[PDB]
Write a protein that binds this ligand. Structure first.
Ligand SMILES: CCCCCCCC(=O)OC[C@H](COP(=O)(O)O[C@@H]1[C@H](O)[C@H](O)[C@@H](OP(=O)(O)O)[C@H](OP(=O)(O)O)[C@H]1O)OC(=O)CCCCCCC
Ligand SMILES: CCCCCCCC(=O)OC[C@H](COP(=O)(O)O[C@@H]1[C@H](O)[C@H](O)[C@@H](OP(=O)(O)O)[C@H](OP(=O)(O)O)[C@H]1O)OC(=O)CCCCCCC
Ligand SMILES: CCCCCCCC(=O)OC[C@H](COP(=O)(O)O[C@@H]1[C@H](O)[C@H](O)[C@@H](OP(=O)(O)O)[C@H](OP(=O)(O)O)[C@H]1O)OC(=O)CCCCCCC
Ligand SMILES: CCCCCCCC(=O)OC[C@H](COP(=O)(O)O[C@@H]1[C@H](O)[C@H](O)[C@@H](OP(=O)(O)O)[C@H](OP(=O)(O)O)[C@H]1O)OC(=O)CCCCCCC
Ligand SMILES: [K+]
Ligand SMILES: [K+]
Ligand SMILES: [K+]
Lengths: 327, 327, 327, 327
């Protein structure tokens, strides 16, 4: 309510009264991988057992059409699967075959032509039942959405006059010595707005130019670096003074997107900054020290902000007051 | 005819008299995965059976060169595969070996040196026959082109003066609590045009600036958000009044591209808006309500449009009439 | 010599005296997949056989340390692998185990503790020998570089005054009803140039603005569409008249990049246009006809160019002669 | 210390006092693949053996609940797994089953219902233990981060007046006849800076416009080509004369990003240039010669730089001195 997207990156959105629920089953794969693990591990368990006893019913039924059960002690009646006698054995024959274990205490014989077809359609279909599930287990393990746990954001965002221009800043860092190839940063300001025609938008997304023009959005992320957005005329913080910033009802949403290095999958690290986390007159503490040929990044001071001197007027007043300085 | 691309996303295009049909077989993998499932499941079935009886013919023929069939009852003649007697058994030996089931009622012996080579070339080639097909079954299951079923578009597009500027708008929403990383929106206007030199183009694609300059095309898609294109001078709707919009022969094509979250594959969600679906003087109904800490998105009102007051002149007249207001 | 990159897309470049040949073996995977298939199929064959007889030597040597061969007829000496007697049988035991066939005519026994370790290190290492090779066979099959065989280019490029501005044009089409998601077009002019300081560059790449500014480079590729580059002042064809175009020594290189739809891999379709393939005063024939609700694309007329009336002056003269028209 | 990122591409950064070490285990897959191979091969070995003897304990314990050990010589007591007698045999039964070898000297029987469940939960869980590890071995083999070994950079960067404008240049080349699809080049200048407000940034990243505006950053990389950055007013080398360039404390970081051709993974090739590797008045030697229809690229002269005549003033003086030439 207070917050749109959590500081973890989770979003406070319930997707209400979706009516076309066939659309979830229209792409059964992607709605399967985004399940919980317990539900993934249960449906993985459920599909193999329902596969084996399905074929185990067919390995049972070919004994009844052939009458191998009707002459079980009669040894001249060579069965389709020898030593298959009961359903506990018939179901056991499928697991030995669909998993390609194949013990051969029960071994299919050649006198029966019917189950030879059943060796095909168990094995040619059991491979895709494997592949629909062994691939589903892989891409839930190798998903990029968990790489964001090692991409940390600053807990607060700060505002200070960086080189004459008032700038909004927040720190982002990577906790690994592996890289984020094609690392891009972008930022959306979301706030309720009301147009001149009465059309009130509840959570309107508005861009924040964190360097999309000059090429500064694509960033190099070995060390924690401060993402500075210059509060200029096009910025949505252009008329925000230090009087309004406790009273505003806005929310920054930052999205650090970039490909995982060891794969080609693209991670997305979301974080947010609400108007009680925006700090006026503060700046970040440095983290890089030089020691024995290497720059050491103390991550304990990653969030540490200290108060510096800063004017309290908005950037709209600060430019015009600078315009009176030349007179 | 009336429509270029369907509201589902399918395109009303037949690809006519393609002559270089070897180009389809020049990349046999990608022309295989885009088949129907019945044709994928049939060619998967067809290739394993034609593999096993191919090797089963070679497991047959090594009995004839060795004369194991010529001394089948003679027990001193240890065969290359013992208990291999007929082609129904020889074909059965391949399925037990190429699938690596290996029952061992028929078990290859060491007295024969010829079939030892045949164990290699069945297993070293049966693995890639597996891999050319078990991978083909995977990427047809894990394809991003089915993720677009959960990316819904508004059924209509609307036009209304959003904050003094006339703007064309359409809603897009995501039906899941999973995200679309790197979600981009772009829009093409396609219409027949005739140049000054008589060169008439049948379906000429023309861009619609939905925010490609400012960075507004890359969008954050947890909640349904309105994609607004400002009707400015560079826009192709610049001289379109409400008199012409029933009479036009144009068609919007919107493309929402973005990577699937759980994989790295990029989905493409197409939709279209023809000149009977463009609404003048209408605007969307809001969908986000706040309830118990979470924003709940009622998707029943996702398409709901209501009529608001709007001038009926074009944006070319609306700017110049505004230019007469300052006089 | 005449041509830099072929009309297929192959490049006429030999990579000379590369000295650091360890860099090829420093990434052994990617230098393996780009081999020919015969060399891929040979190294796949070579690695499994050298794996099995490697372990078959170890399955041999454990018989000598245990002396199972020294008491082969003596039945109280239960071997580590029973019925393992010779190297033809010992090598055969590895294929039955590393492929997980496991017939069980030769079956490992529990009296020996040494080969129990050998079951691990054969199976725990034979799985990655599989995975280093079954994955290598997959990504050579699923590579995007073969998707360019169904992306056709026009054989010629044309130049004609499209709507008052002289424009260079070439057609590109997709031969399938599957799409190219995120389809982008870009074009490089390569020609020898000599700077003012005598530094002569042999094949200097120079951009061609095919719509990179306005968003026209990202194209929608269901139907064959003409890629127009407007010959403006920044264009490298700005002072090229029809007198110079037979005499020039330039070469267009067009690159159509876009992701394959059924996967996430990005294809790259290269083609070229040399100064004998650039046509002045020509324009393309249309290909789209409307028939029974669908637009049918006759691909026979994909390359068909016809001569239209066009001024023969350059775009530098055509603007200035237009500048004299207003006088 | 002297250097931020090595000429190989490695970065001289230690990631200090990371406290939230659960974040590494929160995404156990990606922190596994970035390990060393010895640690990957050990954890792969450790997980299969701890899996098999885990189930081998359960295959042991079902003999004690059933009392198969209590009637081992008594043949009427058909065990759950026949010929399972000791823990050396019970552990051996798991490897024959979890790997799906299945010799059948020990073969599970149907009289026991308990171990039938144990066939499921060994096989339905041993497949994902395979898949969590056979996929981990694949993506460590198929990673794009090793493709950068065949992407070479020039060892030095040079500065010379290319066509009236002073330009900073460095060569990049690809050692293979395979391509880098979507090859982009970007460059960051990193140097310590001190703002007007005393906020001293230790290693501030600053862009270098290598052609991000005109579309020149996306480059075509069949032949070694010189990446030229024009020293203009927005460039950070704008006031750098030849007097300051030995005395500066800056460092170029170049990043050549592009997708691997045979896969869809994106490589990232980093290199660096420190102020002792920047050459004033030097230019590269050409490498392309034409021979027998093909351009041959002598890679021995890839790094070769020769001294040319160049003014020693900065680009700020060179423009203004040119401004005095028109007077
Ligand atoms: C209770 C019940 O019914 O479900 C149990 C639940 C199911 O799986 P489990 O919840 O652990 O799986 C994770 C969990 O669902 C998290 O909430 C997800 O996001 P996050 O963690 O919040 O970031 C995370 O994303 P993804 O991995 O699903 O994409 C999941 O992996 O947990 C287990 O069974 C242990 C996993 C074995
Ligand atoms: C009749 C006959 O000969 O073929 C039957 C046909 C084959 O499978 P089929 O292709 O219809 O199954 C999917 C279905 O057709 C979708 O409609 C396709 O996408 P779209 O909606 O067209 O865009 C989807 O394409 P893809 O995304 O899967 O490639 C299809 O796979 O349908 C079945 O048997 C159901 C699957 C078993
Ligand atoms: C003779 C000898 O020693 O090797 C023969 C060679 C090896 O396989 P090879 O790779 O050449 O097989 C394909 C064949 O060479 C095509 O002509 C190539 O087309 P392109 O021009 O690259 O488009 C294709 O490109 P790519 O797959 O290499 O990319 C090749 O893969 O061809 C075969 O044996 C057919 C495959 C079995
Ligand atoms: C000693 C000890 O405990 O570990 C031994 C170490 C483990 O493998 P190790 O990591 O050294 O093998 C690769 C090598 O170290 C490279 O130098 C690494 O990249 P870079 O050059 O550092 O950039 C590469 O990273 P990745 O790209 O493979 O992840 C490594 O995998 O080396 C071996 O055993 C050879 C492989 C068997
Ligand atoms: K067996
Ligand atoms: K087996
Ligand atoms: K097996």
């Amino acid at each position: 309510i207070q917050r749109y997207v959590r500081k973890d990156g989770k979003c406070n959105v319930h997707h209400g009264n979706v009516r076309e629920t066939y659309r979830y089953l229209t792409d059964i794969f992607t709605t399967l991988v985004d399940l919980k693990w317990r539900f993934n591990l249960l449906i993985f368990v459920m599909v193999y057992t329902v596969t084996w006893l399905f074929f185990g019913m067919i390995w049972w039924l070919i004994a009844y059409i052939r009458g191998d059960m009707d002459h079980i002690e009669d040894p001249s009646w060579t069965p389709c699967v020898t030593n298959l006698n009961g359903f506990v054995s018939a179901f056991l024959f499928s697991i030995e075959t669909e998993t390609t274990i194949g013990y051969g205490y029960r071994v299919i014989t050649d006198k029966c032509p019917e189950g030879i077809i059943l060796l095909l359609i168990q094995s040619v279909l059991g491979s895709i039942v494997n592949a629909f599930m062994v691939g589903c287990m892989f891409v839930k393990i190798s998903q990029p959405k968990k790489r964001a746990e090692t991409l940390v954001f600053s807990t607060h965002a700060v505002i200070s006059m960086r080189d004459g221009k008032l700038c909004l800043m927040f720190r982002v860092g990577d906790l690994r010595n592996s890289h984020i190839v094609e690392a891009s940063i972008r930022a959306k300001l979301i706030k309720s707005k009301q147009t001149s025609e009465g059309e009130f938008i509840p959570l309107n997304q508005t861009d924040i130019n964190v360097g999309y023009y000059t090429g500064d959005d694509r960033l190099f992320l070995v060390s924690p670096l401060i993402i500075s957005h210059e509060i200029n005329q096009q910025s949505p913080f252009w008329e925000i003074s230090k009087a309004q910033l406790p009273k505003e009802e806005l929310e920054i949403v930052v999205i650090l997107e970039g490909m995982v290095e060891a794969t080609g999958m693209t991670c997305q690290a979301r974080s947010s900054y609400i108007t009680s986390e925006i700090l006026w007159g503060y700046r970040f503490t440095p983290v890089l020290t030089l020691e024995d040929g290497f720059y050491e990044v103390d991550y304990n001071s990653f969030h540490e902000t200290y108060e510096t001197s800063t004017p309290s007027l908005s950037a709209k007043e600060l430019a015009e007051l600078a315009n009176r300085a030349e007179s």
